[PDB]
Amino acid sequence: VENPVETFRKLIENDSTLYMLAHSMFDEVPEKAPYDRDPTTLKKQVRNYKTMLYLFNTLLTEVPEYFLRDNPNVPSGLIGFPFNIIVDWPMGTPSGRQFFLDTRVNKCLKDILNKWNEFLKDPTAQGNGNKGGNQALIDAGWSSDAAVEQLVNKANESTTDKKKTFSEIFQHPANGTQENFFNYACWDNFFTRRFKDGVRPVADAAVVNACESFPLSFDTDVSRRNTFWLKGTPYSLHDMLGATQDERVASYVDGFVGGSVYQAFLSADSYHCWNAPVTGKVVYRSLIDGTYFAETAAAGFGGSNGPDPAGPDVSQRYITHIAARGVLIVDTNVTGGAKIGLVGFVPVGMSEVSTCDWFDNTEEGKTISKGDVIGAFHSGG
């Protein structure tokens, strides 16, 4: 069993083209400020792939740091994302764009980030006592007033029924307090925490919000396939839903032609589980392998909206077509359903929050009820 960072090292060094790209994607980052530092401004920018690999290996046993405790005013878009911080500027280069589209690179990143995820769900933090996972969160700043207030404020902004304290909003283990970071056993349990009963009541409407999320796009009359790479990123159902590689979904692509696509963004300080947007019977479910750190040319250096200091934020429409993601298609033309035909739910990874976790209640042939928790994002690949 090989260190996945070491497998990645060998991929880079044993392929002449990837070896080239792994240098050029750093050479193409400008030397001048602000690019001498990563987007947080707190550390020097990494300039070679060996330092990158060293840091990736070190990160395999680290939880993300809440760096806003001691540095409240620096850019905060990459809170939660230590890998993203390292490669953010290289992602915006022509050679970096090519690198992070390579399927072998992305298999290696998948294995690295999945090894990370093993640590993030480890309540011992890899052999540091039964409370190691919890202690690592406290050490990383997450029990600070700044972090807890941020989490409470973000939950409160979407509702009129605002709560004073974290424990009134989210479920956490017994005897949890701010001082012991609510006794969360590990990052993964904190990350996928559930709302307390009655804090997110299920509305009477036929369609409810599937994620605690910030509206991004609403597109009507979408095409079967489209030039998703052109400016404005028109949605391309065929690519998004994975009909490229699974003929079984192609009939659903056809049935969504002329339909509407709604997209919304989940921040790092938001609830990360998925709830059933409608009641109905699951007719299709898939997971689709893809990219992690792929963003548009417009989001890169010299781009009309780049370089993105928190890529792939400004590329969210684009990555629905290529990022690690999942597909769920629900038939509402059933008893107790709203009779609004087929509804698609497509969770899409961003960077190292790309683990798409379908819960067992979404198996094809099962019926889900509007508001049921049906899965979650995790930090990982």
């Binding site: 991004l216 339909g259 509804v343």
Partner: protein, 41 residues
């Protein structure tokens, strides 16, 4: 993280989406999970 919800053409004819979702530039906060996104008309 991000996610899409996808609806069929004839279903959209029957649905009224909330403005914060249908006109996303007006949104200033998260929408609450489980809250109304669209209603039958």
């Amino acid at each position: 993280x991000t996610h899409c919800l996808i609806f069929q053409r004839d279903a959209v004819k029957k649905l009224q989406f909330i403005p914060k979702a249908q006109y996303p530039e007006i949104a200033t906060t998260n929408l609450a999970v489980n809250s109304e996104l669209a209603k039958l008309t």
